[PDB]
Amino acid sequence: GVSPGELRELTDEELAERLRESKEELFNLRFQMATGQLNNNRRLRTVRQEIARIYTVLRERELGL
RNA sequence: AAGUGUCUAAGGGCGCAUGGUGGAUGCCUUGGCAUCGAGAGCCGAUGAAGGACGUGGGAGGCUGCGAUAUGCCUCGG
Ligand SMILES: [Mg+2]
Ligand SMILES: [Mg+2]
Ligand SMILES: [Mg+2]
């Protein structure tokens, strides 16, 4: 997935857009898993973890980075 | 003629032989019991103890966790 090291340079708005597009990817992966066209089922966990990473970066930024 | 004279088993008893059931005995153990030697002696409105519901690629329970959900970041091993 995406590294915290390569996430700690995006400012606030690139972070907010990465978050939104990652959520969109997770939505699409959920529908593909439901309809049976997903092969690599390890993608769900990866996308969830990168979303959690983006929240972690934003929260630590707004509380004394 | 008179007399003597067995055998058999519908079933049963006792003894063997050969099986079945059952789980005693023997020997164990990821479990307990009683202490001894050091700790630490409180937790909570900054929301506790304890829970309900959720959370995994596949059903449920335990266990971990909380919509960031068997996990996120950093520092060590
Ligand atoms: Mg007889
Ligand atoms: Mg007979
Ligand atoms: Mg390390």
Curated annotation (Swiss-Prot):
Gene Ontology CC: cytosolic large ribosomal subunit
GO MF terms, alphabetically ordered: structural constituent of ribosome
Entry annotated with the keyword Ribosomal protein: yes
Keywords, comma-separated and alphabetical: Ribonucleoprotein, Ribosomal protein
UniProt keyword Cell inner membrane, yes or no: no
Superkingdom, taxonomy of origin: Bacteria
Family to which the UniProt record says this protein belongs: Belongs to the universal ribosomal protein uL29 family.
Protein name: Large ribosomal subunit protein uL29
Organism whose genome encodes this protein: Mycobacterium tuberculosis (strain ATCC 25618 / H37Rv)
Gene encoding the protein: rpmC
Entire-sequence positions represented here: 4 to 68 of 77
